Design an enzyme around this catalytic site. Sequence first.
Site, PDB file in Angstrom:
ATOM      1  CB  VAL A   1     -31.179 -85.248 -77.187  1.00 20.90           C
ATOM      2  CG1 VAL A   1     -30.290 -84.034 -77.412  1.00 20.90           C
ATOM      3  CG2 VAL A   1     -31.229 -86.138 -78.449  1.00 20.90           C
TER       4      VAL A   1
ATOM      5  N   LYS B   1     -31.477 -91.619 -74.032  1.00 21.40           N
ATOM      6  CA  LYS B   1     -30.869 -92.940 -73.758  1.00 21.40           C
ATOM      7  C   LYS B   1     -32.047 -93.824 -73.375  1.00 21.40           C
ATOM      8  N   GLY B   2     -32.132 -95.038 -73.910  1.00 17.98           N
ATOM      9  CA  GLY B   2     -33.179 -96.005 -73.538  1.00 17.98           C
ATOM     10  C   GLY B   2     -32.846 -97.358 -74.124  1.00 17.98           C
TER      11      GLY B   2
ATOM     12  CE1 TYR C   1     -32.894 -93.410 -77.699  1.00 22.60           C
ATOM     13  CE2 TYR C   1     -34.783 -94.054 -76.387  1.00 22.60           C
ATOM     14  CZ  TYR C   1     -33.772 -93.153 -76.660  1.00 22.60           C
ATOM     15  OH  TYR C   1     -33.666 -92.038 -75.878  1.00 22.60           O
ATOM     16  N   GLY C   2     -31.102 -97.595 -77.633  1.00 23.86           N
ATOM     17  CA  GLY C   2     -29.744 -97.049 -77.741  1.00 23.86           C
ATOM     18  C   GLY C   2     -29.699 -95.624 -77.215  1.00 23.86           C
ATOM     19  CD  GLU C   3     -25.500 -93.834 -75.485  1.00 19.99           C
ATOM     20  OE1 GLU C   3     -24.718 -93.238 -76.296  1.00 19.99           O
ATOM     21  OE2 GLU C   3     -25.146 -94.269 -74.358  1.00 19.99           O
ATOM     22  CB  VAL C   4     -30.840 -89.823 -80.098  1.00 19.03           C
ATOM     23  CG1 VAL C   4     -30.734 -88.814 -81.222  1.00 19.03           C
ATOM     24  CG2 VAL C   4     -31.637 -91.023 -80.562  1.00 19.03           C
TER      25      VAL C   4
ATOM     26  CE  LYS D   1     -32.135 -95.852 -82.588  1.00 20.69           C
ATOM     27  NZ  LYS D   1     -33.520 -96.274 -82.887  1.00 20.69           N
TER      28      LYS D   1
ATOM     29  CG  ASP E   1     -42.867 -98.592 -82.439  1.00 18.37           C
ATOM     30  OD1 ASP E   1     -43.878 -98.554 -81.716  1.00 18.37           O
ATOM     31  OD2 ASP E   1     -41.729 -98.482 -82.012  1.00 18.37           O
TER      32      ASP E   1
HETATM   33  C1  LIG Z   1     -37.517 -91.078 -82.809  1.00 22.54           C
HETATM   34  O1  LIG Z   1     -36.469 -91.514 -83.678  1.00 22.54           O
HETATM   35  C2  LIG Z   1     -35.418 -90.646 -83.872  1.00 22.54           C
HETATM   36  C3  LIG Z   1     -35.404 -89.344 -83.412  1.00 22.54           C
HETATM   37  C4  LIG Z   1     -34.285 -88.523 -83.663  1.00 22.54           C
HETATM   38  C5  LIG Z   1     -34.325 -87.090 -83.186  1.00 22.54           C
HETATM   39  C6  LIG Z   1     -34.143 -86.114 -84.154  1.00 22.54           C
HETATM   40  N1  LIG Z   1     -34.195 -84.787 -83.820  1.00 22.54           N
HETATM   41  C7  LIG Z   1     -34.436 -84.511 -82.515  1.00 22.54           C
HETATM   42  C8  LIG Z   1     -34.620 -85.397 -81.504  1.00 22.54           C
HETATM   43  C9  LIG Z   1     -34.869 -84.881 -80.129  1.00 22.54           C
HETATM   44  C10 LIG Z   1     -34.105 -83.791 -79.667  1.00 22.54           C
HETATM   45  C11 LIG Z   1     -34.352 -83.278 -78.391  1.00 22.54           C
HETATM   46  C12 LIG Z   1     -35.303 -83.874 -77.593  1.00 22.54           C
HETATM   47  C13 LIG Z   1     -35.524 -83.246 -76.231  1.00 22.54           C
HETATM   48  C14 LIG Z   1     -37.007 -83.075 -75.922  1.00 22.54           C
HETATM   49  C15 LIG Z   1     -37.320 -82.849 -74.416  1.00 22.54           C
HETATM   50  N2  LIG Z   1     -36.082 -82.641 -73.626  1.00 22.54           N
HETATM   51  C16 LIG Z   1     -36.448 -82.520 -72.191  1.00 22.54           C
HETATM   52  C17 LIG Z   1     -35.232 -83.811 -73.701  1.00 22.54           C
HETATM   53  C18 LIG Z   1     -34.855 -84.132 -75.160  1.00 22.54           C
HETATM   54  C19 LIG Z   1     -36.093 -84.947 -78.051  1.00 22.54           C
HETATM   55  C20 LIG Z   1     -35.862 -85.475 -79.317  1.00 22.54           C
HETATM   56  C21 LIG Z   1     -34.549 -86.779 -81.806  1.00 22.54           C
HETATM   57  C22 LIG Z   1     -34.674 -87.847 -80.742  1.00 22.54           C
HETATM   58  C23 LIG Z   1     -33.184 -89.044 -84.349  1.00 22.54           C
HETATM   59  C24 LIG Z   1     -33.212 -90.382 -84.740  1.00 22.54           C
HETATM   60  O2  LIG Z   1     -32.146 -90.940 -85.469  1.00 22.54           O
HETATM   61  C25 LIG Z   1     -30.945 -90.188 -85.568  1.00 22.54           C
HETATM   62  C26 LIG Z   1     -34.308 -91.154 -84.470  1.00 22.54           C
HETATM   63  O3  LIG Z   1     -34.327 -92.481 -84.866  1.00 22.54           O
HETATM   64  C27 LIG Z   1     -34.710 -92.691 -86.214  1.00 22.54           C
END
Ligand SMILES: COc1cc(-c2cncc(-c3ccc(C4CCN(C)CC4)cc3)c2C)cc(OC)c1OC
EC number: 2.7.11.30
Lengths: 286, 292
Positions: free
Chosen positions: B10, B12-13, B15-18, B31, B129
């Site tokens: 969902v 990549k940058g 920060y790594g990848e989620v 993450k 941040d």
């Molecule tokens: C910021 O930080 C962290 C975030 C998360 C996290 C948790 N739930 C959901 C998300 C997510 C899901 C899906 C999208 C979509 C939105 C738009 N679409 C077009 C592309 C992608 C965006 C975001 C994330 C990124 C987990 C983390 O750690 C495991 C994070 O780091 C602490």
Amino acid sequence: QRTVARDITLLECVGKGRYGEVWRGSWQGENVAVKIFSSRDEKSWFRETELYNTVMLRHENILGFIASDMTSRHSSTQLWLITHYHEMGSLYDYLQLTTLDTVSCLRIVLSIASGLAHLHIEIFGGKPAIAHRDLKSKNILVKKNGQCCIADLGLAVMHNPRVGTKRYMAPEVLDETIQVDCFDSYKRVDIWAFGLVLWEVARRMVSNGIVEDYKPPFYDVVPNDPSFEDMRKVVCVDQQRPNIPNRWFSDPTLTSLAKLMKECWYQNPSARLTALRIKKTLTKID
Amino acid sequence: ARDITLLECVGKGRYGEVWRGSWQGENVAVKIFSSRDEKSWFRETELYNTVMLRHENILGFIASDMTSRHSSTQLWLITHYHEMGSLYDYLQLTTLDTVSCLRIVLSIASGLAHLHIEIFGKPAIAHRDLKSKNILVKKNGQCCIADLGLAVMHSQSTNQLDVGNNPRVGTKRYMAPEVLDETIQVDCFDSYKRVDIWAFGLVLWEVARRMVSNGIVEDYKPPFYDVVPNDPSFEDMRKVVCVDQQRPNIPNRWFSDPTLTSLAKLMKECWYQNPSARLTALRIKKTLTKID
Ligand SMILES: COc1cc(-c2cncc(-c3ccc(C4CCN(C)CC4)cc3)c2C)cc(OC)c1OC
Ligand SMILES: COc1cc(-c2cncc(-c3ccc(C4CCN(C)CC4)cc3)c2C)cc(OC)c1OC
Ligand SMILES: COc1cc(-c2cncc(-c3ccc(C4CCN(C)CC4)cc3)c2C)cc(OC)c1OC
Ligand SMILES: COc1cc(-c2cncc(-c3ccc(C4CCN(C)CC4)cc3)c2C)cc(OC)c1OC
């Protein structure tokens, strides 16, 4: 995309203490060792994890890191350290029943010196210099190939209300004269403790049909679970050192090891041998 | 039941990848940190060790792992998964009514006050941040604050300040004047809370632009979109914030709407150049509890 198989089967508890517990575990058919930390000793998990996050140590005489895990529970945090499993157990365990010949005694002590010099040395590019700060026979594991590896970096310093095991504390720790801002001070504390381990092992080496029983350092001058004061009076005030039995002086290996021990036990920390000098001396014995 | 299936990347940058993954029949977020950002992983792990950090408006923690074989290390953080994504994502594609706008901003204020206030436990915590990509939208219309890798902890009980050891700096677009001119008082915990308040004010502005009044709404834009280059440098931001004394413009249409008039007032009290003049997170939460 990919399966991340994280399940570990805990099979046998191999250690229980104030630190928590160590288990023999199974991951993907392979033995692992799982240290489960008490609340009391969370800072040891944090320090070992911080160190491995700074430098991924990989050395035949350092217990092999596999993983650090933090898991959220309802009302608590669960902290595990996962490492290689050494089925022979600790050097402390091994020396209770087993006697040694010249080759096995040297192999044990030179492998420990090797692991310790690897901790101590800064490599540029590499690793920071590391002092262990709780070296003792319970923190050394015996491998199947007869070499040992050093475990437990929960007190390690790089260049915690936990302190070192009192029985193994150097005089400058017991008299609080240690120069705490000088990294080399911590290397010299480890050399002291190394010399006590060398004594523990050498006692179990047979010569002319004689061996000593396993005893911990200072067994004849302090109680079990000696106090800080008990140790300070022996090591600092009276300046006692572990006994060298007469029978060692009939054996060239034990004669050389007695000399080595002596040069780990100087009152003046800066007079003590370095781990690299101990390795060279051990390579020239026999 | 410990194992995890990685289903979809969902994000990549730098920060790594989620990843969206599956764990014990539930979606989770996984993450994987870039090896360059190892100090963030460790700091987030120190923060989530605290049982009393748990809060409806803080991203919920499941596990943290460091794994290694040979010379390869992986750093994992496993959290709750919010399939609506970040507030940044959400604001691109939806407009808000008064009720939703206030629910979002009060939830973020609630999270931030929870971080800033010591529990006698949970230390006082400054995030460092805060931005719309580090806020997740939950299905109940509240948000939760994510990414504690830059956090600073303080205990007034023991007079201890833990600034950690992380070379990473905040997102440039959201940096307070005192961060951009490097005059921030680094051994003062209140300095870091004040940096969070500045960034909160910018997030308030981003959200308020998307709230409809009188049939009008603004397009989503990030803070300072109009005055800096794309992908602004540290010095680009320092120019507009510190040299040019710029603050995000308040659209004049806000002044006919009581809610947006109140929010514009609140933003302004987050944006003083004097950090000590800025409102506290608790005062913002109380003010948003009273606005409708
Ligand atoms: C910021 O930080 C962290 C975030 C998360 C996290 C948790 N739930 C959901 C998300 C997510 C899901 C899906 C999208 C979509 C939105 C738009 N679409 C077009 C592309 C992608 C965006 C975001 C994330 C990124 C987990 C983390 O750690 C495991 C994070 O780091 C602490
Ligand atoms: C999270 O937690 C645990 C994970 C594991 C574990 C299980 N299978 C596979 C892995 C694995 C290793 C490395 C990669 C690489 C592949 C190449 N790519 C370019 C970078 C990433 C992917 C996957 C891991 C790390 C074991 C654990 O314990 C025994 C864990 O728990 C502590
Ligand atoms: C000091 O430190 C750590 C040590 C270890 C560790 C690694 N291999 C093997 C062991 C072990 C196995 C087996 C026995 C005995 C048990 C009874 N009977 C079966 C004979 C043998 C003892 C000891 C241990 C305790 C792991 C750690 O963490 C994961 C340690 O902490 C860093
Ligand atoms: C944590 O511990 C263990 C982990 C694993 C394991 C499982 N999946 C994937 C991996 C892996 C694959 C590929 C890369 C690299 C390859 C080169 N380049 C492309 C960078 C990426 C890294 C890692 C590993 C190492 C296995 C183990 O034992 C067999 C482990 O030990 C118990």
